[PDB]
Amino acid sequence: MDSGVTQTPKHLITATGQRVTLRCSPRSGDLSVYWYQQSLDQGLQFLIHYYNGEERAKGNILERFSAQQFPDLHSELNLSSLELGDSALYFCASSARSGELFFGEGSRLTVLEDLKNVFPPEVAVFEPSEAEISHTQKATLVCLATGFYPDHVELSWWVNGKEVHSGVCTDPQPLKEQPALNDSRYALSSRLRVSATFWQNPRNHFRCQVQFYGLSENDEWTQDRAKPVTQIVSAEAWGRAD
Amino acid sequence: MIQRTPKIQVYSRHPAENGKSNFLNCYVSGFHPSDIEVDLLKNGERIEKVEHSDLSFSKDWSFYLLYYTEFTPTEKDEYACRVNHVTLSQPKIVKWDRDM
Amino acid sequence: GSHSMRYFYTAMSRPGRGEPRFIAVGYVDDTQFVRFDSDAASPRTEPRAPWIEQEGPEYWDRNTQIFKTNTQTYRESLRNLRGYYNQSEAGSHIIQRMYGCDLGPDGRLLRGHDQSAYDGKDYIALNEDLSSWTAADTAAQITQRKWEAARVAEQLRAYLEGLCVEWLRRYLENGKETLQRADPPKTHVTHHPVSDHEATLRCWALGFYPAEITLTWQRDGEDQTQDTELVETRPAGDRTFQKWAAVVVPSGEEQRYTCHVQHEGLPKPLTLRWEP
Amino acid sequence: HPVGEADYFEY
């Protein structure tokens, strides 16, 4: 599973011309840090390498990008004067004595022209059709996350306060609600299927949770609606015997 | 083990002929540590612009290099090599003779 | 015939706490062909043989980056070593390293080498099996553990059997006619009287390449050895080498002494005498 | 051609 390398923040959304800093802790016992960049429709690209607090090697990292390894052995990568084309996954790895590179979970950066078009999702849960129950003896719930921008959502299913993975699948990619528009808002759907019996218990509780990553609370907001900050939006359903 | 004294040979590139242009070699080998001072001499006096090969080391870890300059040997002129190294109390002078 | 490639590294610390100097030299047999010296503002690997000049800029950068990285890491190693041996800051010490590959007459690898010394004395060496280490003492055993953990042997083995052999074969072809031509020694015997114990018989070998040579005096067909003065093989400066061997003889008995020379450029040993 | 030393190759 997870290597042991810690990368924060997992998500960044910011404006062009701005500056961001990404953080990386290597595995315990590893002394090196490598930074990589993964742009859309492009593979991993080597940026820069540190060993025990010292810069060791340099890839095709831009001059406006910079990094350091601290005495902690933790590392910060700084990207300044951000452009749209800086939108990417940034990965760090630490190397083992044995040679292998072990990667973190990545920081995903989205750089937008401005932030006026950022929107959190609305979410709704749709209850299983009586017809499905009658025909299959199973019961599917559908979650819909709608009208969000940009792409940064994590949808999960919670049954009785615990997260579930069996009987769920969610669309690999979100749908463009207005595909011809460049800053089109997104839709995403997910299904959770339980047995008809399981749905037919009024004590069974189902919640769809959508974590949205948006503005970073410190970003300015002049608009008349609520600031589209990082937030979770939920909808829920209770079981129905009947 | 700590320190090794330089071995020294002074010699010509080709066999000596009293009218014929040649090269004067002073080969210093078998020493440690690597800092060394080498000068070639004409009649006891220091020869100005001498070249040397790059410093390297042998299988036993000891250092060596070559000092060399153009010269025309005569029956009159004395030639010699002067070397100092941390191991020597005073510089070590070795006379050139064309038979060695 | 047989050929080898060797890189010689020197990493030495300076008094007080100045930046240690790293030097790399590369050799094909007895022919130097590259040098890098870290003591400069912008150090670069430099050619020292005509046949390497044809290598493109990427070749040179790869060398320079290896040697620039080594400059930094060999500094940490020097600090590591002065810890092992409880030695103070000021404080001048030297790591020496030699490695490379030997080729037989066929062009196949005969053996690889990787050898380190600390202050002129064997420290750690890669064994013939190219997979295990021989450590001189408990300090070198600490180095051995680090290197086993980092699979140094396995990576060196991969280098010695591939990259090393491949590039050595390239240099040999590119530098053929100099590297692949053996110049035989030009030989003569000189006679220098000294009256007391009579005379010197000196056996010369000049202008030979490569350096490897054997010069021995025989009396009545018998290796003298004990009372033969052997001079160190020395470079003539034009890429060839020189050596002599001398014995002191009781005058009119010169004819019972023979000089013997063995060299790659000689199909068989030469038997030589004094010409009156 | 020389060999490149990987990470953690110090003495």
Add this chain to the structure above:
Amino acid sequence: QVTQSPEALRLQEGESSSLNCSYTVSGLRGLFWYRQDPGKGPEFLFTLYSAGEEKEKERLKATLTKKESFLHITAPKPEDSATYLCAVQDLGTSGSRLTFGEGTQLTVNPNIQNPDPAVYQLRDSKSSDKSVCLFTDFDSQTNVSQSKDSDVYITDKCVLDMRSMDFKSNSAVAWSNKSDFACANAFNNSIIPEDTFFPS
């Protein structure tokens, strides 16, 4: 320096295949295989050092030649869907940096045991009369076509795994924000199995 083929792999469950990774390097330090799931970092699989070396772990087997490496996937399952990354270290460069290929994005199309294709109407729990259309339980070979209507939203097919009772099922969702939108006509643009169940 590292080239992987094919770009994208579209396999059926149980259909073996082998993913190519070609490499050119001054000297091979190490060849690496990684797995990357969507929204995840590369996860270590294998490292191979010399020509003729093999490593195997369950359905995956990696081999190494002077010129390329193959990742053989035997009888793959839906769970094997991921991007498979190849990477190399070079003996001619210092440190342990990797140079990556662009990867092979693999999707394994699941077998469907007992397809029961049907379109159901689901209603919002909250609610104010909102609804959704669910095309579910179709076989592995039927696919969900997109709508040219901008006011109708239709998802791609998605496989749910009810591990508890060895039961997978496919589904896609359709919804529209207004006007005569009956679920009976929702997936109209797709080839629909003639046996699809439409409740009244």
